[PDB]
Amino acid sequence: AWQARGLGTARLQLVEFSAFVEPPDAVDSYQRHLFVHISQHPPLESVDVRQIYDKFPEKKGGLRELYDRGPPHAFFLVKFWADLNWSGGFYGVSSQYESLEHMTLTCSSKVCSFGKQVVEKVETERAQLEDGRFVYRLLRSPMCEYLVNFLHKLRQLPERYMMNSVLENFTILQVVTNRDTQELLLCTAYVFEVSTSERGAQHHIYRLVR
Numbered sequence: 001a002w003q004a005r006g007l008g009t010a011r012l013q014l015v016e017f018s019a020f021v022e023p024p025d026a027v028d029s030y031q032r033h034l035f036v037h038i039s040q041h042p043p044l045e046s047v048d049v050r051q052i053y054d055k056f057p058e059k060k061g062g063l064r065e066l067y068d069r070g071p072p073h074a075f076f077l078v079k080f081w082a083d084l085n086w087s088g089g090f091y092g093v094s095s096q097y098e099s100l101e102h103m104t105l106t107c108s109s110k111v112c113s114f115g116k117q118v119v120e121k122v123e124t125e126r127a128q129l130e131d132g133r134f135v136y137r138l139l140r141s142p143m144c145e146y147l148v149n150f151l152h153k154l155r156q157l158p159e160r161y162m163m164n165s166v167l168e169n170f171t172i173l174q175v176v177t178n179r180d181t182q183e184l185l186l187c188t189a190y191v192f193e194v195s196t197s198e199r200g201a202q203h204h205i206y207r208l209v210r
């Protein structure tokens, strides 16, 4: 009855999320290539979280501990089929959330390889009042150089199944918390495959249950 139908909770809803590259010539005629993209402008299916425990960090800030803090309804798994056909351009990530209440968000994004945290980015965004609800805009964050280099290497692999093998061990954990109260608002686990290109980016969102 109170089961999510999109990625978010009654406190904080994902509006839009994308990762993209704009070619250097974008200044002349604009174009951006979307690696992955969620736009949220029946209940979702569910995946038991224990199955994905070892794809993410441990001991602290890991999935089990986070799920242990709660709240359980705030945990989502997103599977992406990334579009890897698109050098020297701008690699960016854009996130947008909204809420009924005014908070200061802290958003932590962790890239893990074989479950070991490899890179982490932490950002805060203060609410902006706008049309009844509050909007949080973390737009055009530069991709970190580890991911850009990873994408350039990945795009070079001679077989799609080889990119999928490599991506089997690559995950991203995103945890959004109330900066002031420390309460977790949204935790999203991302897992990745490569899209055949022809099909651009796709995704499938699941609730994480236990």
Ligand SMILES: O=C(O)c1cccnc1Nc1cccc(OCCc2ccccc2)c1
Binding pocket: 019, 035, 036, 082, 093, 109, 110, 111, 119, 120, 121, 141, 142, 143, 144, 145, 147, 151, 167, 172, 190, 192
């Ligand atoms: O923004 C950053 O530097 C950043 C830093 C630390 C952690 N996470 C970050 N961002 C982020 C979050 C979620 C997805 C995403 O990229 C999808 C592209 C992609 C990557 C690999 C295989 C296929 C497709 C980027």
